Design a protein around this ligand. Structure first.
Ligand SMILES: Cc1cc2nc3c(=O)[nH]c(=O)nc-3n(C[C@H](O)[C@H](O)[C@H](O)COP(=O)(O)OP(=O)(O)OC[C@H]3O[C@@H](n4cnc5c(N)ncnc54)[C@H](O)[C@@H]3O)c2cc1C
Ligand SMILES: NC(=O)c1ccc[n+]([C@@H]2O[C@H](COP(=O)([O-])OP(=O)(O)OC[C@H]3O[C@@H](n4cnc5c(N)ncnc54)[C@H](OP(=O)(O)O)[C@@H]3O)[C@@H](O)[C@H]2O)c1
Length: 512
């Protein structure tokens, strides 16, 4: 049938895209998701230790103040089952499920350049027509299974963290974990005390700081809910949106005693972004500052891990670091008698047999269970996995063959009436604040189309290449170089797009 808008995704971005377009702008709209329930990545990713790296009171929606006062704030950080339960309550309250079609994947989306709408086809050969396409696909594509010889011969339990089954038990089992990223650190910390023996196959050690996830008292929660209006105003007025006191103090402008005290204070409070952006202001910019942040965490590793040779294996060797990981006792794990750490860069994995992982030294690591916390493909992977064709039938895979590009992280030279929520080339901040910022900006432009009887918004290649130059300008100011992301912060990003919404959407081709 016909719709004013069609949304792909029932996660954070899709649920708010549905609420804003349907109830506030009174548009006819339908959303689609492969899953059986809302939640997005929080429905799929149920691996042990899954936890937000934003604090509980900020990893949520800000637009429903009755929901904020209603909100469950159990611990300082929120687990996957509680994020899922929160998103379900959002769907229960605002009557969202009746306009979501579940168990329905989108195969193709073709823009009708004549009638100026999109032709969307599901994986079941069902076709829907709609003026606008809202893509809220998130950061997911399950496969980065390790390309290891004989991985298909393993007869024990083999799980990727994105497809974690239920009823997994660990007692009496020899378990292996490949990968020490954010997910691997969470899995290893959660299961180490439950397994008979754990082998960690680390190819690249990373910096991790304690998260300090503690229960929240009723007065801790009251201290938040009573000041929630000011808390969100600080989010909109910040670069990261994590509720941090973002520092402008340069690292080398204080004594070594003063520097050590500031790093220790953030370490005790917890949080990876706090240690990097609440301590000082040039850790991601100046090289000498970045090395000081490294040395503090290296000193912490050498203090926690009592075996100096294990601590050495856990210490990163790269000269310059980016954002640390957050953990609830990761480095303490490696003091346990039932934990073995394997440097698979000096001793790579060469084969997987029916009952073991064998490294280059010939040692067979016998395992009952092998966990692959090996990550996924890139941002665009969610977009290139759908057959999206825009003007002159050009596909989203072809136009993004040389990496992704967009205008304000929301529109592409492929997009005539297709708006990206949390898409590539967006800001680097707390996701729910970013998602609210884009959904409100996208609905404003769509409302700016219904009143003026316009039916085709497009973005120039000049505007897309101008957004690429903006991001490339800020990105090369930082150590994070050596254009996927805008690194100017959430506040400046809201100003970049406000100058567009004010100047009658400069860079956008409107056709009546
Ligand atoms: C364990 C974990 C912890 C995290 N913690 C934080 C945090 O603390 N702070 C933060 O800012 N971010 C965090 N993130 C990142 C997180 O992805 C975002 O916060 C947020 O979930 C993004 O919401 P989204 O709706 O844009 O994407 P998603 O939540 O991933 O939703 C995407 C949905 O679109 C669906 N979909 C896709 N494609 C298609 C298709 N062709 N047809 C049909 N349906 C489709 C998918 O099935 C999926 O349900 C975390 C991620 C994980 C996995
Ligand atoms: N920044 C955060 O705090 C945070 C928190 C939650 C989610 N996320 C996002 O979720 C995404 C995925 O996180 P993730 O931890 O699941 O994966 P990841 O960050 O991409 O890291 C995957 C880990 O598995 C290792 N690995 C991959 N292939 C391997 C192989 N063939 N052999 C041996 N080891 C291999 C990698 O080692 P190498 O490093 O050597 O490649 C890496 O340590 C991240 O990109 C991140 O953006 C981030």
């Amino acid at each position: 049938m016909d719709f004013d808008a069609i949304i792909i995704g029932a996660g954070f971005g899709g649920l708010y895209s549905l609420k804003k377009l349907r109830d506030d702008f009174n548009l006819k709209v339908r959303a689609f998701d492969r899953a059986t329930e809302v939640g997005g990545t929080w429905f799929w990713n149920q691996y042990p230790g899954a936890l937000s790296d934003s604090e509980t009171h900020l990893y949520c929606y800000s637009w429903d103040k009755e929901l904020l006062q209603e909100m469950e704030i159990k611990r300082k950080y929120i687990s996957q089952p509680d994020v899922l339960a929160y998103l379900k309550r959002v769907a229960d309250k605002h009557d969202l499920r009746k306009d979501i079609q579940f168990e329905t994947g989108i195969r193709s989306a073709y823009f009708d350049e004549e009638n100026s709408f999109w032709n969307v086809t599901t994986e079941n050969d069902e076709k829907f027509t709609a003026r606008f396409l809202i893509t809220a696909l998130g950061l997911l594509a399950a496969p980065n299974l390790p390309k290891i010889k004989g991985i298909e011969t393993f007869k024990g339990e083999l799980h990727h963290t994105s497809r974690w089954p239920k009823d997994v038990t660990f007692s009496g089992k020899r378990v292996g974990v490949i990968g020490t990223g954010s997910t691997g650190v969470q899995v290893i910390t959660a299961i180490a005390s439950q397994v008979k023996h754990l082998t960690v196959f680390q190819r690249s050690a990373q910096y991790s700081v304690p998260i300090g996830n503690v229960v929240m008292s009723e007065t801790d929660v009251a201290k938040i809910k009573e000041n929630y209006d000011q808390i969100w105003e600080n989010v909109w007025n910040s670069a990261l949106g994590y509720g941090l006191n973002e520092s402008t103090l340069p690292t080398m402008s204080v004594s070594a005693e003063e520097r050590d005290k500031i790093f220790e204070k953030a370490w005790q409070e917890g949080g990876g972004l706090r240690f990097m952006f609440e301590t000082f202001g040039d850790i991601a910019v100046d090289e000498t500052a970045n090395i000081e942040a490294q040395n503090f965490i290296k000193k912490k590793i050498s203090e926690i891990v009592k075996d100096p040779f294990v601590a050495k294996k856990l210490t990163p060797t790269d000269l310059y670091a980016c954002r640390p990981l957050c953990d609830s006792g990761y480095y303490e794990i490696f003091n346990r008698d039932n934990v073995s750490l394997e440097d698979v860069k000096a001793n790579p994995i060469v084969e997987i047999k029916e009952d073991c992982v064998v490294t280059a030294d010939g040692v067979e690591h016998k395992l009952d269970m092998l966990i692959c916390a090996t990550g996924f493909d890139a941002v665009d992977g969610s977009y290139k996995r759908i057959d999206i064709r825009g003007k002159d039938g050009i596909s989203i895979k072809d136009h993004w063959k040389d990496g992704p590009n967009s205008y304000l992280g929301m529109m592409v030279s492929n997009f005539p009436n297709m708006f990206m929520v949390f898409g590539p080339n967006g800001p680097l901040a707390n996701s729910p604040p970013i998602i609210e910022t884009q959904v409100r900006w996208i609905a404003d432009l769509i409302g700016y189309a219904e009143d003026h009887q316009i039916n085709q918004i497009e973005a120039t290649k000049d505007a897309v290449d101008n957004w690429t130059n903006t991001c490339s300008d800020i990105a090369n100011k930082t150590l994070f170089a050596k254009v996927y992301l805008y690194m100017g912060g959430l506040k400046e990003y809201r100003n970049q797009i406000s100058e567009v919404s004010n100047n009658n959407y400069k860079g956008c081709l409107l056709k009546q």
